[PDB]
Amino acid sequence: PDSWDKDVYPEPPRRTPAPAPQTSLPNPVTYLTKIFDLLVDRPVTLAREFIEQQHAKNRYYYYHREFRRVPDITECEEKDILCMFEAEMQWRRDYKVDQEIVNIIQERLKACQQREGESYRQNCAKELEQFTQVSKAFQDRYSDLGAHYSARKCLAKQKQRMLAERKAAKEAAA
Amino acid sequence: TMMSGRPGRVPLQFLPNEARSLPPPKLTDPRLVYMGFLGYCSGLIDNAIRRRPVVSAGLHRQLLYVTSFVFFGYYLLKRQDYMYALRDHDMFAYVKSHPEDFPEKDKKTYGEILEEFHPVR
Numbered sequence A: 001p002d003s004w005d006k007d008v009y010p011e012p013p014r015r016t017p018a019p020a021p022q023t024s025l026p027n028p029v030t031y032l033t034k035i036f037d038l039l040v041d042r043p044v045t046l047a048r049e050f051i052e053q054q055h056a057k058n059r060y061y062y063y064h065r066e067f068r069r070v071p072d073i074t075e076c077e078e079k080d081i082l083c084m085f086e087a088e089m090q091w092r093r094d095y096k097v098d099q100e101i102v103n104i105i106q107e108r109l110k111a112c113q114q115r116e117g118e119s120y121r122q123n124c125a126k127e128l129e130q131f132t133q134v135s136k137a138f139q140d141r142y143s144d145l146g147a148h149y150s151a152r153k154c155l156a157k158q159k160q161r162m163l164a165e166r167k168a169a170k171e172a173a174a
Numbered sequence B: 001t002m003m004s005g006r007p008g009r010v011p012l013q014f015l016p017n018e019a020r021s022l023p024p025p026k027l028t029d030p031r032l033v034y035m036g037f038l039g040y041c042s043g044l045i046d047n048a049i050r051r052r053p054v055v056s057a058g059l060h061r062q063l064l065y066v067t068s069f070v071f072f073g074y075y076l077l078k079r080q081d082y083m084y085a086l087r088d089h090d091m092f093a094y095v096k097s098h099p100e101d102f103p104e105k106d107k108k109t110y111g112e113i114l115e116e117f118h119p120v121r
């Protein structure tokens, strides 16, 4: 369906086997499917067609709000309240977007497990690696900030991580 | 005594002539409204103590209460604004005259400032 993006929400092509009956007995599943299509599918389709015809007469639109980039806390001077406010708001919006990215990856993982069914341990290894990488990055970003998290705390954590990496690299090179 | 003995202060002067250059409080000041409310409450308490009908009796007396409270509140607000303006003026003059005591500090960005991180776990 065109409601979502197939790249963002992939689905492998669906291979449905063709029916190959081997008995003369009638198929109750087929008979009940035909009855269901006759009694339910056609009325709901007619109702939806009427509703969608009504909708097309009053077609109006809504837009996606766009936010421009602003200087971040690394550029903000010390105790410059306006720049700090702008940077904190931008950081919070980026945090929300990252949370939604993690949610998308988790939805991919769940859908792939359910789809593969009995062979999930092997066929879902591709989506498990992406989730592992995304979770690692998200944890390194916002792992232990606390309830009163802020862009300053995230920046201090990043500085600590960078200093630790530099120390490890220097020790290795020594 | 901080501003007592300030140079050029005339004793027993509620409002000096230098206060005339400041914006007078508007008559719709919330502080003036609160002073009028205090006057009305005083009138109501007077009626209650004297056992008159609290809201009806002594309308002229209640009006006099409100008017007196508004008058005194207006003059008190003028004096308060003058005193605060004088304090700010003196503070700014002293800061300007003592730069070695109030030096501007170079501003370093958070990309340069190193802050210790304390994890919450």
Ligand SMILES: CCCCCCCCCCCCCCCCCC(=O)OC[C@H](COP(=O)([O-])OCC(O)COP(=O)([O-])OC[C@@H](COC(=O)CCCCCCCCCCCCCCCCC)OC(=O)CCCCCCCCCCCCCCCCC)OC(=O)CCCCCCCCCCCCCCCCC
Pocket: B040, B041, B042, B044, B045, B048, B052, B053, B054, B055
């Ligand atoms: C209105 C809200 C006010 C909020 C608080 C603001 C500050 C206080 C208000 C100013 C003072 C008011 C008068 C005090 C004495 C009242 C005596 C009395 O009976 O009064 C009944 C009186 C009518 O009764 P009446 O038929 O004339 O005579 C009946 C006898 O007085 C009947 O006499 P009785 O012999 O039967 O007396 C027996 C009674 C006598 O009891 C009393 O007299 C109680 C009242 C006096 C106690 C102290 C009052 C507060 C003084 C300041 C203290 C701080 C206040 C803030 C505290 C905050 C934290 C609690 O004793 C007891 O019940 C003893 C047991 C209870 C004792 C323990 C409780 C004590 C509470 C103390 C704190 C109360 C705070 C709120 C008080 C509100 C009073 C209305 O009603 C009023 O006074 C109503 C209030 C005024 C309304 C004005 C309306 C104007 C037109 C509409 C304006 C609309 C807004 C404006 C803008 C335009 C819009 C279109």
Ligand SMILES: CCCCCCCCCCCCCCCCC[C@@H](O)O[C@H](CO[C@H](O)CCCCCCCCCCCCCCC)COP(=O)(O)OCC[N+](C)(C)C
Pocket: B004, B010, B011, B012, B013, B014, B015, B072
């Ligand atoms: C030129 C011809 C026209 C002249 C016009 C008159 C000029 C002024 C004349 C004043 C009347 C004559 C003198 C009468 C006594 C004077 C008392 C007062 O006016 O003097 C002022 C004093 O003003 C009053 O003290 C202010 C009264 C404020 C009342 C409220 C206080 C704040 C309470 C906080 C809660 C308020 C709740 C609301 C209350 C209504 C300044 O006196 P000052 O020589 O400098 O005092 C030195 C001592 N100090 C420094 C320690 C104080």
